[PDB]
Design a protein around this nucleic acid. Structure first.
Lengths: 129, 186, 262, 149, 151
RNA sequence: UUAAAGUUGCUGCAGUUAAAAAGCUCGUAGUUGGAUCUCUCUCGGCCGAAGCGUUUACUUUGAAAAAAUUAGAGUGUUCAAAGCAGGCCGCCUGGAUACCGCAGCUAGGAAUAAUGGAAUAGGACCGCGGUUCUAUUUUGUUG
C-alpha cells in the first residue's frame, strides 16, 4: 500500500527532472509535502507551484528550473540531536558549500542551518542538493 | 430586527434594520421576513472609493435568508447608491486546544467550528447566488499564497460586476488574497 | 569486609585535598567526628600541606602534642581530626586565626581572620525535635545539640554560636533575598542571593541563586548555607568573593598581571 | 488490489465536486427521510435504499440532501438490524458454500473458497468488536451460523 | 459474619470497640468508628474506605503501610489470587548499534484494597512503593482509571 | 586479536545465468500503516504562592553524577615520555576546563508520531427547587 506519501512526492520530482521536464504532478498533496516544497523553493531549487483542490487529498503542480541534482527522503524519521547533525550532513550532503538537510523541529520544518541558528534538534525528513 | 449578543446598535447597523422595516410590510415578502432577523452590519471601503455592506445573520436562518437573497439585494441596493450588499452567516471559531489550556475545552471541538472550515464556508456565503466549481492555490517565490476560485457561468452576468468587491470583503474577513475566474466547461 | 575500614588510598581521597600521586600509597583517613569524611580537611593536610609549618607527618604530631592548635576553642591532639566548613583554627604561639571557607574552585581556602572574628561561628540547622519533659532540641551541621532554642528557628536556618559558651546569639531564617554559599555539588564555593525555591514533595527541593554580576544557577536545598541577611554577609569572605570567573576571563586576568610586572 | 484475489481493477464511483443539491430536485429533507422509512420496512438494506432512490426519485446522495447517512437515519428511528449488512451478507454466503459442501465431498475448491470467506468474516468481526458494535463475546460458529441468518 | 471469615477476630488496632458508655448507646446504634489516614502525594482517599467495613492491614488508607519511593503506572492483566493483582508495564529499549528500539515488558504483582471496587482487567492503575508485603510484592494501588471502553 | 572486510553490510552487500525466492495460498504474534483540525479561579505586598493542558514519545535546558585514564589549559624535567610543580627581590602564584551512553529527577518548545475527550445523550454552561448526612461561627461562660 501507499505509506510515506512524501517519499512518493520526492521520487516523482526527482524522476521528472532527470527527463528534462518543465512540470510535475504530485498526488496526493499533504502539508508536510507543502512545507518541504516551500523549503526547497525559498533556496531557489524549484520555483512557484500550485495546489489543486479535489474535495479530497488534493494534488500539486510544480514548475522545474533544472537546478536540482537530487532530492530524497530518509525513512524512518530518525531523531537528530544538535550534536549529531555534523555526521548526518557529512554522510548525506555532497559538499560543505551547498546542499541542505530538511528536519522537522518544534519550531517548524526547516533546514540544518536554521536549526543551528535556533539551537534545536528534531527528526530528519530528508535532503536536497 | 437587529439582535446582537452585545446589545449595542449604533448609527449604521440601525440603518439596515430601518431599511428592512419598510420592506417588511410594504413588499410581497410579508411572512418571509417577519421571523427573520440580522445580527450585525458593517460598511467597508473597496476598489479605491467604492463601498460595500456586509450583513451578518444567524446560521440557522442562513438558508431562509438566501432563499430570497436575490430580491433582497436587488431591493436593498436602491436606498443607498452604488454599494454592493453581501450576506454572511455568523459563525464562531473555537481556538485549537494546546498543551497549556484552561478547562473551557471540556468537550471535543466540532470540526464545523474549525477556522479553515469557517473560512471555506464564508467564501460560499459570499459568492451567492453563484456556486464554486473549482479552487486553486498558487504559492509564489516569496512564499505568499493566492487563492483562485472558479465560478459557474450560469450567474456570470449576475455576479461578474461584483468580483472586485468579493476580494475586498474576503481580505478583511479572512486575511487572504483571492481572485475569481470563469472557466470554460466541466 | 567483616567490619569497618581504617585505611584510605591516595587516589580514593577527596580531590579537593590536592594530593599528588607519587608521595605515597596511602592518605590520612579522617577520624570520626562532626564532619563527613568526604567534606572535611584533616589537620595534617592543613598544617603540613597548606601552611607548610611541617615537612613530614611526624612533625605535625610534634606540633599537635605541644597543644598549640585549637579547633573552635578546644585543643585537639589528633592529627587526622576532621575539621570542616565554618570552623575556626587558632594557633596562639604565632597569633593566627583561620576560617575554613570554600573558594570559587571548590577547595578550602587559607582565610585568615581577626581575633575578634574567631569568637563565633555560623551553623546550619539540621534537626529540631522535642525531648523528654517537653524540651526543644536542635541538631546542627556541626553535630551540636543545643537545647531551649528560640521557637522561631526552623530547619534550614542559620544560627550564630559563641564558641566560648556554645549558645545562640542570633539567627537568620531561610527566605528569598538572603545571601548564601553553596556547600556541595557543581556550584561549590559560590556566593549569591536566593531568588526562588521550587518544592517537589517526596523528593529534593531546588533553590535558585543569583550572583552579584548577574549570573544565575540552581542547587539542591541541602547544598545551601545562608550566610547573611540580604546582601551583607555575616562572616569575612575570601579573595574571590564567591564569583566564578570563566576560563577566558581568568586567562585575561592572569596575562594582565605579568604585563604589570617589570 | 483485491484482498483474496490477484485482481487489480479500478472501477468505482466518482463523486462530483458539487456537494450541492441541484435546483430541479424539489424534495425536502423530511420527505426524503419518509421514503427511507417506507423502504426500510420492506426489508431493504441501506445500499438497496440508496440505489432505489437514485434510480427513481433523482436522489444522487442523501448526505447531500438531508445532511446524514442512511444507516444513521435508520438507527435514529430504530430500524437498523442486529448485524451489519456487510457481515450479514458474508455469513449468508458461508452457509450457502457450506450447504453445497455436504452433497459434494470431492469439491476441493469450494473448500478453499469457504476458508477465504470465513477469513473475511473473522476480519470484519474483529473490526466490529473493536468498535463496540458486536458484543465482545460474539463468535462466528461454522455450525450455528444459520441461526444468525 | 461476612467481616469475620477468618479464625482470628479482625479489627483495626487503633480502634477500641468496648467503650462501655450507657444503655442508650447500646440502644441507639452499633457502628464502629473507623481508622482512615490520608496517604498523601496529592492523592485522595476513596470514600469506600471511609464508609467501608473491610479489615485489611496492607491497605494504604486504612492499614499499616507507608507510601514512599517510586510512583509508577501499569495496565491490569490478571485478577486471580486473593486480594492482589498482576499488572503489565510496556516500554521501549534502545539498541544503539542499529539506532532503533525494541518492545519489552515487565509483570509486577501489586496489592489491591477493597476500597477499589468495580475494577476490570483492562485499565490503568497508579502504584506506589511500600515495604515488602510478601515475597514478590512491594507496590500498592493508589488510583484506578478506567480503560478506553469507558462506560 | 583489530584494521584491511562494502568478504556479516544499521551507515553498507547479495538471491535470472557465478552461492542463493519457501510448490502455492490462508492465518495469530511481530513489523508497517492514506487526506484531514490556527491557561486561570482564591490569598501575601501591578506580581508571586496553588490547580492543570488527555497522556506520552521527541528536542533544548538545569542538577546529580569517585579518583586515576583519555581530550585539554598553565609550567624550559637541560629536551622528551613524565611530574604538579613553581616564579621575584620575605613576597607572588597554580593545583583549570571539557567529556561521563541507557535508565531515574527538573524546566521551556509543540512540527513530526501515538492517545482520549457529546450519538440508548447518564453532554457542557447557567440560574431554580426537594431527600439525607453534616460545619460546630452566634445567644458575656457553662447545659
Amino acid at each position: 500500500v501507499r505509506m510515506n506519501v512524501l517519499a512518493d512526492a520526492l521520487k516523482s520530482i526527482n524522476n521528472a527532472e532527470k527527463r528534462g521536464k518543465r512540470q510535475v504532478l504530485i498526488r496526493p498533496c499533504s502539508k508536510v509535502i507543502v512545507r518541504f516544497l516551500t523549503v526547497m523553493m525559498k533556496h531557489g531549487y524549484i520555483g512557484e507551484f500550485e495546489i489543486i483542490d479535489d474535495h479530497r487529498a488534493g494534488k500539486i503542480v510544480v514548475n522545474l528550473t533544472g537546478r536540482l541534482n537530487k532530492c530524497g527522503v530518509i525513512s524512518p524519521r530518525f531523531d537528530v540531536q544538535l550534536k549529531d547533525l555534523e555526521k548526518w550532513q557529512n554522510n548525506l550532503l555532497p559538499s560543505r558549500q551547498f546542499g541542505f538537510i530538511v528536519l522537522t523541529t518544534s519550531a517548524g520544518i526547516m533546514d540544518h542551518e536554521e536549526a543551528r541558528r535556533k539551537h534545536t534538534g528534531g527528526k530528519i525528513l530528508g535532503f536536497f542538493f | 430586527i437587529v439582535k446582537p449578543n452585545g446589545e449595542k446598535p449604533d448609527e449604521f447597523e440601525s440603518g439596515i434594520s430601518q431599511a428592512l422595516l419598510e420592506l417588511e410590510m410594504n413588499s410581497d415578502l410579508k411572512a418571509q421576513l417577519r421571523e427573520l432577523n440580522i445580527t450585525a452590519a458593517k460598511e467597508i471601503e473597496v476598489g479605491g472609493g467604492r463601498k460595500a455592506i456586509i450583513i451578518f445573520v444567524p446560521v440557522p436562518q442562513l438558508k431562509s435568508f438566501q432563499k430570497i437573497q436575490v430580491r433582497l439585494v436587488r431591493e436593498l441596493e436602491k436606498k443607498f447608491s452604488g454599494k454592493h450588499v453581501v450576506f454572511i452567516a455568523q459563525r464562531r471559531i473555537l481556538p485549537k486546544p494546546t498543551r497549556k489550556s484552561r478547562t473551557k475545552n471540556k468537550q471535543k471541538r466540532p470540526r464545523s467550528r474549525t477556522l479553515t472550515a469557517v473560512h471555506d464556508a464564508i467564501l460560499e456565503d459570499l459568492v451567492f447566488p453563484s456556486e464554486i466549481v473549482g479552487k486553486r492555490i498558487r504559492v509564489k517565490l516569496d512564499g505568499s499564497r493566492l487563492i483562485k476560485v472558479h465560478l459557474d457561468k450560469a450567474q456570470q452576468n449576475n455576479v461578474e460586476h461584483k468580483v472586485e468587491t468579493f476580494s475586498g470583503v474576503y481580505k478583511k474577513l479572512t486575511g487572504k488574497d483571492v481572485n475569481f475566474e470563469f472557466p470554460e466547461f466541466q | 569486609a567483616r567490619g569497618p575500614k581504617k585505611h584510605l588510598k591516595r587516589v580514593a581521597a577527596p580531590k579537593h585535598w590536592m594530593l599528588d600521586k607519587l608521595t605515597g600509597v596511602f592518605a590520612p583517613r579522617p577520624s570520626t567526628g562532626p564532619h563527613k569524611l568526604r567534606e572535611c580537611l584533616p589537620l595534617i593536610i592543613f598544617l603540613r600541606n597548606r601552611l607548610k609549618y611541617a615537612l613530614t607527618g611526624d612533625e605535625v604530631k610534634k606540633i599537635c602534642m605541644q597543644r598549640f592548635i585549637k579547633i573552635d576553642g578546644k585543643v585537639r591532639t589528633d592529627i587526622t581530626y576532621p575539621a570542616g566548613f565554618m570552623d575556626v583554627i587558632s594557633i596562639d604561639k604565632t597569633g593566627e586565626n583561620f576560617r575554613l571557607i570554600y573558594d570559587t574552585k571548590g577547595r578550602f581556602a587559607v582565610h585568615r581572620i581577626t581575633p575578634e572574628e574567631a569568637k563565633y561561628k555560623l551553623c546550619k540547622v539540621r534537626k529540631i525535635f522535642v525531648g523528654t519533659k517537653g524540651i526543644p532540641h536542635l541538631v546542627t551541621h556541626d553535630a551540636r545539640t543545643i537545647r531551649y532554642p528560640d521557637p522561631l528557628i526552623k530547619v534550614n536556618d542559620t544560627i550564630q554560636i559563641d564558641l566560648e559558651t556554645g549558645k545562640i546569639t542570633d539567627f537568620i531564617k531561610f527566605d528569598t533575598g538572603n545571601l548564601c554559599m553553596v556547600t556541595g555539588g557543581a556550584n561549590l564555593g559560590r556566593i549569591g542571593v536566593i531568588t526562588n525555591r521550587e518544592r517537589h514533595p517526596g523528593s529534593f527541593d531546588v533553590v535558585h541563586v543569583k550572583d552579584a554580576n548577574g549570573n544565575s544557577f540552581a542547587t539542591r536545598l541541602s547544598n545551601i548555607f545562608v550566610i547573611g541577611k540580604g546582601n551583607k554577609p555575616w562572616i569575612s569572605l575570601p579573595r574571590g568573593k564567591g564569583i566564578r570567573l570563566t576560563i577566558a576571563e581568568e586567562r585575561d586576568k592572569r596575562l594582565a598581571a605579568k604585563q604589570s610586572s617589570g | 488490489g483485491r484482498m483474496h484475489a490477484p485482481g487489480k481493477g479500478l472501477s468505482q464511483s466518482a463523486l462530483p465536486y458539487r456537494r450541492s443539491v441541484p435546483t430541479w430536485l424539489k424534495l425536502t429533507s423530511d420527505d426524503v427521510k419518509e421514503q427511507i422509512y417506507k423502504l426500510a420496512k420492506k426489508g431493504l438494506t441501506p445500499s438497496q435504499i440508496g440505489v432505489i432512490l437514485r434510480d427513481s426519485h433523482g436522489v444522487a446522495q442523501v448526505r447531500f440532501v438531508t445532511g446524514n447517512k442512511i444507516l444513521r437515519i435508520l438507527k435514529s428511528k430504530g430500524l437498523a438490524p442486529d448485524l451489519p449488512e456487510d457481515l450479514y451478507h458474508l455469513i449468508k454466503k458461508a452457509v450457502a458454500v457450506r450447504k453445497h459442501l455436504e452433497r459434494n465431498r470431492k469439491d476441493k475448491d469450494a473448500k478453499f473458497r469457504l476458508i477465504l470467506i470465513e477469513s473475511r468474516i473473522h476480519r470484519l468481526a474483529r473490526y466490529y468488536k473493536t468498535k463496540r458494535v458486536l458484543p465482545p463475546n460474539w463468535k462466528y460458529e461454522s455450525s450455528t451460523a444459520s441461526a444468525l441468518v | 459474619a461476612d467481616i469475620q471469615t477468618e479464625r482470628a477476630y479482625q479489627k483495626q488496632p487503633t480502634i477500641f470497640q468496648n467503650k462501655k458508655r450507657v444503655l442508650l448507646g447500646e440502644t441507639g446504634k452499633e457502628k464502629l468508628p473507623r481508622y482512615y489516614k490520608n496517604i498523601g502525594l496529592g492523592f485522595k482517599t476513596p470514600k469506600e474506605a471511609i464508609e467501608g467495613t473491610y479489615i485489611d492491614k496492607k491497605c494504604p488508607f486504612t492499614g499499616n503501610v507507608s507510601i514512599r519511593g517510586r510512583i509508577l503506572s501499569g495496565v491490569v492483566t490478571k485478577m486471580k489470587m486473593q486480594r492482589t493483582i498482576v499488572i503489565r508495564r510496556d516500554y521501549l529499549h534502545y539498541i544503539r548499534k542499529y539506532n532503533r528500539f525494541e518492545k519489552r515488558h515487565k509483570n509486577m504483582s501489586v496489592h489491591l484494597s477493597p476500597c477499589f471496587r468495580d475494577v476490570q482487567i483492562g485499565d490503568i492503575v497508579t502504584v506506589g512503593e511500600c515495604r515488602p508485603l510478601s515475597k514478590t510484592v512491594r507496590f500498592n494501588v493508589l488510583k484506578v482509571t478506567k480503560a478506553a471502553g469507558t462506560k
